[PDB]
Design a binder for this molecule. Sequence first.
Ligand code: SSS
Ligand code: SSS
Ligand code: SSS
Ligand code: AMZ
Ligand code: FUM
Ligand code: CL
Ligand code: CL
Ligand code: CL
Ligand code: CL
Lengths: 418, 415, 464, 440
Amino acid sequence: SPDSYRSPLASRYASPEMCFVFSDRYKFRTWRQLWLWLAEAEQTLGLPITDEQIQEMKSNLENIDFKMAAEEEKRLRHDVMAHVHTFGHCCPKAAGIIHLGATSCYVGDNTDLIILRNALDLLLPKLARVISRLADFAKERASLPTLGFTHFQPAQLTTVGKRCCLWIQDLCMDLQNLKRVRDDLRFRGVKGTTGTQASFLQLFEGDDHKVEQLDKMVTEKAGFKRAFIITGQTYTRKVDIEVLSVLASLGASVHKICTDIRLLANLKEMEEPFEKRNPMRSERCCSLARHLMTLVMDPLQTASVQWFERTLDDSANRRICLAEAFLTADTILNTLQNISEGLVVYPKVIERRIRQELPFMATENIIMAMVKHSQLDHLLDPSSFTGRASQQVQRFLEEEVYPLLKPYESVMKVKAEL
Amino acid sequence: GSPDSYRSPLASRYASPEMCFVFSDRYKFRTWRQLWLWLGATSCYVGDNTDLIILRNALDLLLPKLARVISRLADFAKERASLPTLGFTHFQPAQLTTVGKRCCLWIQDLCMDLQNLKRVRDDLRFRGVKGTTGTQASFLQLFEGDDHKVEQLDKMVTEKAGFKRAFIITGQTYTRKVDIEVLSVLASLGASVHKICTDIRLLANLKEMEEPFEKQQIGSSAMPYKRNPMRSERCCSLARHLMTLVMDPLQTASVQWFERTLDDSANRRICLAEAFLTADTILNTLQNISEGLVVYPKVIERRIRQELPFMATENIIMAMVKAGGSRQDCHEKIRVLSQQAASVVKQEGGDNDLIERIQADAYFSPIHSQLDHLLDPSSFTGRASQQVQRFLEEEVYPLLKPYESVMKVKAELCL
Amino acid sequence: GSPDSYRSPLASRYASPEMCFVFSDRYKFRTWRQLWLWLAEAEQTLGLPITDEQIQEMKSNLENIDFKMAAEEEKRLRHDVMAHVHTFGHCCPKAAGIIHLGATSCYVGDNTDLIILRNALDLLLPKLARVISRLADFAKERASLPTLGFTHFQPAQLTTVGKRCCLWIQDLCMDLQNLKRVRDDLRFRGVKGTTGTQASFLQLFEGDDHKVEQLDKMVTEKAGFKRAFIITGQTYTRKVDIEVLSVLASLGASVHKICTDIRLLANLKEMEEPKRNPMRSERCCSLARHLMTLVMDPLQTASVQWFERTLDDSANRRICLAEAFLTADTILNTLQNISEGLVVYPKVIERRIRQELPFMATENIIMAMVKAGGSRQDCHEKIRVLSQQAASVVKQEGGDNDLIERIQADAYFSPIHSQLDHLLDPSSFTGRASQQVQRFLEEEVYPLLKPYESVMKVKAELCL
Amino acid sequence: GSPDSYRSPLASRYASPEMCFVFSDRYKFRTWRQLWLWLAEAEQTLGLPITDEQIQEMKSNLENIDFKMAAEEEKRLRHDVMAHVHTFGHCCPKAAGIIHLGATSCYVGDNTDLIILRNALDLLLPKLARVISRLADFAKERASLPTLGFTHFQPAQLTTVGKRCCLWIQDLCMDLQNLKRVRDDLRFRGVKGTTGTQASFLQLFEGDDHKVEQLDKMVTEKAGFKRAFIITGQTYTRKVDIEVLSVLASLGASVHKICTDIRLLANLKEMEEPFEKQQKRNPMRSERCCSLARHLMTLVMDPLQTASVQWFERTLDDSANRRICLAEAFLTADTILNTLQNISEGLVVYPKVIERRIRQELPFMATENIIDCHEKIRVLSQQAASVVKQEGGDNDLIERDPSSFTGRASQQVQRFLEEEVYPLLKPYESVMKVKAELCL
Ligand SMILES: Nc1c(C(=O)N[C@@H](CC(=O)O)C(=O)O)ncn1[C@@H]1O[C@H](COP(=O)(O)O)[C@@H](O)[C@@H]1O
Ligand SMILES: Nc1c(C(=O)N[C@@H](CC(=O)O)C(=O)O)ncn1[C@@H]1O[C@H](COP(=O)(O)O)[C@@H](O)[C@@H]1O
Ligand SMILES: Nc1c(C(=O)N[C@@H](CC(=O)O)C(=O)O)ncn1[C@@H]1O[C@H](COP(=O)(O)O)[C@@H](O)[C@@H]1O
Ligand SMILES: NC(=O)c1ncn([C@@H]2O[C@H](COP(=O)(O)O)[C@@H](O)[C@H]2O)c1N
Ligand SMILES: O=C(O)/C=C/C(=O)O
Ligand SMILES: [Cl-]
Ligand SMILES: [Cl-]
Ligand SMILES: [Cl-]
Ligand SMILES: [Cl-]
């Protein structure tokens, strides 16, 4: 409803798919999924849980009474316990075995880790598409000379495609980082209130092996290759630093790229798509990318003051910054893909600017000729001042870019939103 | 709204309804049409002036809540001005303070915030009527070259919007430096609240003080015996976000090119509202905490008894010397007895028995009868209770005076 | 110092000698001794057993600091303040027993830091005022010089060079107001004792509260502060450090925006600082950025100070306070130098206006047409087609804007051909720009500069 | 340095001599000259008109740097690189004409910075490894020692001293993995020309692309890098600076958390950092670590901002910022690791205090064994809690065996140390013996 504040990330910017990943339906559904997996594995390992209790839970995974959970939360001041009661109300037989041996972080943290990994999996293809569209552009314009800029003053010629490779390289570094974080992300698993699994050890009457099995079993049900051995109550909040640092770095890359595009628009050498002509899409990318960089200080601060086995001063902050970083990243990648699909180049403006400055950039050619008038047209040919630019493009795209794009070949065809 | 898609936690969970509506979309387009009933304009005529109206309303909602927090803590500070408590530097036992004096550390920081929020609210200027690049060229042409009519128009809508003052100089926008000034003060407030709520969480570990806890409240899903400072922890958590947010407007302002670039717009839709919604939640939550603080004097007194003996050694020597003992002998004998008591505490896990040892040693016969008086906690608190009253009267109560009519409201939490 | 070990570029390269001296260890430890002397003086006046000869001994050795011996004491004790108490007591053997009487380390640590902060603000203020003044001269001189306006960095309604300069001046004036406010409202820690209770001083004056308050007020006045805290822990509240570095961070943002504009104006060839690269402006941006970054230090520090003090503030503050001020010092000096030597190229400014103004001017041309034979509709539609033709020449052929040539050639505009020079006159497109400049400078700028009139003449030098 | 002007406490107080030397001007300008020599060497080998005597002249004067003359040239020119070219040419009069042949300032500026960063990472890695190793010894030694667990800093189910130590070790191991990765993946700028096109070098080799690639690869190997960028502007991408300072910022957070825990353990009297006999016992070393670690976290916003506003092939608004933040991040990291090593070598534990605190909370720690049950114990627990706090009494679950209460803690320690920690320490086995000294 427009009568109260609504995040522009929900109402304006981010994709439906990313919005669903950070939704409360997906969150509390996944809590129930985790409670089911715990009960399943606990029964398999010999605890007194009946087939009918398990079926009851399985039938009501998505049957979530939000109104009743809010009333319980107002009464108890504990969101996890509110949802245990609410789940126990629609599963009266199972009510007594839900959450058996566990702490709130069993559902809280593991859900957050499932969410993070799904969210990374949504970002990766979009980033790959951005890189791919820019790679097409870079190849197509590999040989098109353009005035180089250092200190934003006229400098030795480069090419439009070579400059595009500066942007592509930064984005490829981001793709490498996002892949790494996604692949190295570990599950909290089943660890108990302070990470000792003391509760589960007592439930299995001192059988260490059964405890390790339980941990490994729910880890596999959730689709993770690996779980922590060491935790406190929580997974280490250093994980949140690693994830938001990579998104912050992506922010910087996008901000630089979109800043270049905005400058190229002033120069009239290049313009973003349009369905006075302003680079509004690039400006929005910069704007949002900035927020992405800002957000890195949240998890840095959070992790630095976590006392002992956990303090709850992480919780509210994480409800805000994790979702917003991903929703912001999602919007920037979509928007940048749309930009890269529709870039318009104006070679006659590019050539005119070179003609105005190239004379100053030469003179050394004219002296070398003198040492030995009719040659002047050939000596001021812009193509000869670009050094190895077009050769650099081809070598870079082949050796460094195309191999990173290979795994996303099947999803390349999707066109952007806006 | 729905739970089938993402909602901001500040909207769904934390934010007061008034502050929610201040950053509301309906409230934004009411203000936009209010501003056109008040034509050669640019988008920022409604965009920026609405944002300035919103900021000022939002500050006006925060101010009373902060004042109430200060007032509740001031009541607490007066009530406990003389209650001795162990001082802490490096979080090690240190010269005694009082519960109320410590509360004044918190009150002072919050008063500095109230001064800052008042200042920013009062000095906030209106963009007014300025045209596409701030030259008013459109309005000058509409009034066929009459400069005076243009200045009047600017001054007139400025007054209709309820601002004392408008910029002379703008580009298309009001300078985004204004956004730095507003979020810097909220960031500083964040730091104050984080420190205070961190102290409260430590006091809970020490069992000297606890935040309010409802009859039916559950601390933990797994440990039923637990009572956690979860309200204070949430305050810290949100206060941190408030500090983080200051880098948004700092960065935004630094890269605004010429008379305006639009890379401010999306960022400002996020950070301005969220800073105010975050501040709103923390003030309401901290008010609720301060209204319900529970103190445990018996624990406070026990901790003093355990540590005071070590603090008091200089008093005991001065007494011994006054009774005609030797500073050298006295110092050396206390030193040995102190290490013995220290080893009992650390190596045996026992109580501090230094007083028991001094009573048992016949070298201190001259001062045995003085020992109750020499270890009296009231004499170790210096000027603590006098500091409280002077501070409350000279520095705190005057800042609260304008909010006297709205002090009675209690702060509710539904989670 | 020596190039064989790391030196801060803020010391070795950037900041002024005067700011460097304010954050030096000589000034620091000299001021520790000054504060110990003031404490002894006031304590004697209020009746404590301190002789005139002990006071004179301390007064004679304020500058006589054995750094080698203080380092050896610090290696043995691991306490910098106590090391310096011993070292001071070694050259003042008679006074040794009464130095630091009743005090805690923060008596010298914090009060020195507050004296340093205030001196450092007093060095920044005039430099900022001079920057504002030089830009104000420039703004007045160029108040009427039309220049292309920029929104989204696209051509937009004309402004003037002086009016644009006022955007910069305004932000810097807000900084001057902020620095003045913080300087004036800065309070002294004074004499407060280990946990801020003054318990030690109360015992020294045998329970006389009034004598304790006078001691506090007396050393506060000797240090030259109008006001002291009533409430402290061991330290002054580290919120003070947030207030100071926030204002410097905001200044950073202002300077970064201004110097970014100047760098863009250099690309446009409309303006240059004193291949020609705007390296001074680029350095200002670079350093201004560090100034903005630094604000998160004190925000974090203050937020995790437990109870009456934790020492996790100390090392951080040795770095960030000095560096913020040294960075600010360099940026202001460098920006003053830039503003003193700005070179403008009006012929380039005029050429760029000629290229774009035709597109801006269509509304004037219609109003003239309506005033002649009329039809706003026909006029609008015919200009629209001719404008797209001229636009394609600019973008697709890389040519000059020929829209005026096309309007002269089209016989529909016969009624207004003779008006065209006057209708495209840049002076009439600048709205109230020059009037805004004069009103702003008089009402808002000159009054803030008035107190710094005597120090305006100093030129800002650069050695690299 | 002299105390009459401001000096960085990172130089004058905190960081090691070795890290200070790496960020010194002697090492910087010495390395500029080294890079000019390598360029001349490779250029001669590839056929450019450079004599053996010109190369010798340069090689003899690598360390012979006239700082006074370079400052005078820099005041005259306002270009530090060109000042040093003139100054170097002044002592190698024969070579003067071929110094910097074909190159741009970033050839010496950036490549030196990349050599410095790599060396600096190589100094940090062993110190971090030693910290992890000392804590690993401690963790094994105390794997079975029960201690009160803390969540929300309230008493919670028992852990062990060694298991808690593994929380710290894990975070630090993640840092070691990150520092290794960044060190190994760091690429050289190499030889790239004013705008990264190598146009100058292409013209010098009369259009021979292959010779240009060889030159790049040759100086890259002389500098000891496996790999160089293909793509650059004038500079290496400043995103590299984000990657390096992000990892150091994350390390800062880890150290801050650890040292915060230690400071809390000191209040509880369960554990204390080392003290020097001649030194109330405060955790001042841990407090300094926190203090400096904070600065390390703060610094990450410098390179994030810098990279985001680099226009086109380069803008010079990176330069001053990088002179400050790169050195300071590494010097700050250096100090924190050395100081934390010293702390971990001297940790003192007080088991009798640990045991007493457990005895005081034990009734609550048996509730997990005993577990609508929850609700009951909750009401009876608040009743017992009020007796403790409001009446000052013992915890009484009259209202209602230590051995099971630490769960799998000691087993977790052994599995973690063996599977995850010891393998990361293996390469640093030869340098483990060094003790970490502090002078203040
Ligand atoms: N308000 C503008 C401006 C502007 O003010 N000035 C124009 C002229 C004018 O609008 O009067 C100029 O070129 O000077 N440009 C874009 N927009 C709009 O900004 C909105 C973009 O939302 P975003 O997601 O980027 O925050 C969205 O509502 C629009 O894109
Ligand atoms: N100033 C103190 C304080 C303190 O205030 N102590 C009180 C008593 C108390 O607070 O317990 C006193 O007056 O003695 N504690 C340490 N230090 C010293 O601070 C120095 C810290 O240097 P760092 O490297 O951490 O910046 C370092 O040289 C010193 O350790
Ligand atoms: N290194 C350069 C560059 C540059 O890379 N220029 C190219 C050419 C070009 O891109 O235009 C070149 O090969 O020289 N420009 C300046 N300077 C110099 O950098 C010094 C910067 O000082 P700062 O105080 O900002 O760190 C300062 O002493 C010098 O200005
Ligand atoms: N895991 C825990 O220790 C824990 N302790 C309390 N809680 C509950 O989680 C919620 C936290 O909300 P917030 O993130 O706003 O602090 C509250 O309902 C609180 O009782 C937990 N999840
Ligand atoms: O809710 C839980 O399970 C844990 C709470 C706590 O550790 O206090
Ligand atoms: Cl669990
Ligand atoms: Cl307007
Ligand atoms: Cl004092
Ligand atoms: Cl090069």
